Symmetry: C3
Subunit: 279 residues, 3 copies
């Protein structure tokens, strides 16, 4: 049902694709990592950005595909963070979004996160990745066991029904597998660090506009509610300069693509699919 | 090749996913139901509505995805009712449209229909469903054996090439597996019942505008040609108040979503994926 | 890993679907042809056109899905010719685009091309096809072994970075498996032949506007740079009468659909999915 038990019964197993099945019984294939900290991490999702200029258009499966509309039928986006919809396949996880049943079925304790440059074939994924970390606090069990139930518990990613830090989500300390806080500070915007703290993963942050964002990889949000620039995923509506802040990678191009200025992420991060692993 | 033979050779089998193959030989997995009336029903399709406000937009795979355009290249929609295109996977059949090869390959005698609330995991599908029925007239054999050939025989779902009841499709009497005619009358619009009769499934009805609709689940159409409000699927063009009548669930929101008024379906039906089974 | 070795170890095998795996190990199914010139051709792609009137819209996975935009994030299209993204399934390869891992993994010497009318079930593919040819020059080995590496070598299909014939791609002589140069001259536009020569396949031609097109099936381009009318695929931007020249089948409808006049392809070719095989 996961790569963890595969590592458990069968010790010497290594990285690669394995056959798994949901407990309801449908088969699928998942990329098991078996070397990271005892191994056993199952790849369950990937947040790829095909076009930073396309503001909630085709391919922004994680935020919205029909635009940024505040209508009652639009503010919930695609719910791809909190629904059973699955898409993409394994070896294309670095060229377009990917999500397999293991996202919601497999129960887990910790999540691991990789940043892999787009276009990277499978055999390079671990060595070509620029950032790799994972949590070690077993925080998923009180939250339902996976991110699906984590977004049934606080939060349903709904626009407007919260506020910045007063209503933010959890902030989990991470351990670095590849990369370091200096590199973290080198990949995010310059004005990023003025309101964050490296070394944590943050789930369901609220921006200044009450719009919720799923994930902030690498840093915990401080009292700075300009979170559209360093957190990915989201709902289907953001009102500040709409729709310049829509997409899988919400506003990483505020001041120009990859130019790495006050509000612009480094180019190395604009081309980085964010792999999510369960254990 | 189907779940019927699986039930035949191997008796005691129950609900769940099984491995099947088309006669051309490609493998797939299908959810076999084995308790309904001797069992043996294969799940072959699912008409999910992700956004009732999106009029022939992304996700309306059963009616049209490019809008309601009367141009010569547009009036045929996506033909997903009468083509070999397949999409989605099994356990996501309750969060987005689903269709597997068994739709056109497997020959069958009867169809079964379920209404399952969106977001329902597989293990709940039968018990959480609100409506379940099936035909018992073996009407698919004269029509080619499945719905694909049923839409090669009358009708190619083409706009304009017919009229209401004078050119309507078949009306098959159904037996109720869960639900009853009172509940049926409770789920459809109020002004619905003024022109229909419970207890039948109707295929290829024509609306007042000559636009054809694939399926009317639960009721047979009378001389009332306002069929956009209780029949799903369709072609790529409907001219009355275009495009307020486009989508997988064509006009179930004419007078407000789920408000259950003169032309509005009950909320319980707006969130209901329509599962189709073959036998 | 391909159908070639399946033909090699196991002689008498015939046309049909077989199980293959990438060298990284993920399984898939591919349609192996085993009769063409010793057989062993693996079906790896299919360029289907669902709507000639939709100019770079949903379903034009090979050229662009977000329109014809000259913005820096748009001129590269979807890169589906040169990325690991895969989509569609086998038996639907004649109703919508299709591409499997064998596109980029399998190394090959020659390519075969079929034109199959849309809606054709699998069992008819070979006999219902109108054109079938294949190269016999083993030209893929110097280019990386497949079309993916062929579009890492010249050319990255990028708009503007070339010109017509001075910077065109390779022109490979083909042998005819079904069809002949008279039929070829009968399927393309009338004003087509005034600037081409039958009997070659041409990869990465540049149109008069420096926009690059992936493939010209059946003919080699002469000094005529009006290539938008007989070459398929492309990038995400064409500037002449934008966007009347966008789509999988770029401009085969310049003077009316299927009307077979000066700039219009024959109707038999407008409904023809282009199957690509490796060996
Ligand atoms: Ca994306
Ligand atoms: Ca802000
Ligand atoms: Ca739908
Ligand atoms: Ca009406
Ligand atoms: Ca296409
Ligand atoms: Ca031209």
């Amino acid at each position: 049902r996961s790569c963890k038990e595969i590592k458990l019964k069968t010790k010497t197993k290594e990285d690669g694709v394995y056959c798994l099945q949901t407990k309801s019984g449908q088969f699928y294939q998942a990329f098991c990592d078996m070397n990271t900290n005892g191994g056993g991490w199952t790849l369950v999702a990937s947040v790829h950005e095909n076009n930073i200029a396309a503001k909630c258009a085709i391919g922004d499966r994680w935020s919205s595909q029909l635009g940024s509309n505040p209508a009652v039928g639009f503010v919930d986006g695609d719910r791809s963070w909190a629904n059973l919809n699955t898409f993409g396949r394994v070896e294309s996880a670095t060229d377009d979004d990917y999500k397999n049943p293991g996202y919601f079925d497999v129960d887990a304790e910790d999540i691991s996160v990789w940043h892999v440059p787009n276009g990277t074939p499978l055999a390079q994924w671990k060595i070509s990745s620029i950032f790799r970390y994972h949590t070690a606090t077993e925080f998923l069990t009180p939250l339902g066991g996976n991110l699906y139930f984590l977004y049934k518990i606080f939060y349903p990613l709904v626009y407007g029904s919260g506020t910045c830090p007063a209503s933010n989500g959890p902030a989990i300390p991470i351990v670095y597998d590849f990369g370091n806080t200096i590199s973290v500070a080198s990949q995010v915007c310059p004005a990023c660090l003025g309101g964050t703290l490296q070394g944590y993963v943050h789930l369901r942050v609220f921006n200044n506009e009450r719009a919720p964002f799923a994930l902030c990889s690498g840093l915990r949000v401080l009292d700075n509610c300009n979170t559209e620039h360093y957190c990915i995923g989201g709902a289907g509506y953001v009102p500040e300069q709409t729709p310049r802040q829509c997409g899988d990678f919400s506003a990483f191009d505020w001041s120009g693509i990859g130019t790495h200025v006050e509000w612009s992420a480094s180019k190395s991060l604009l081309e980085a699919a964010v792999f999510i692993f369960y254990r």
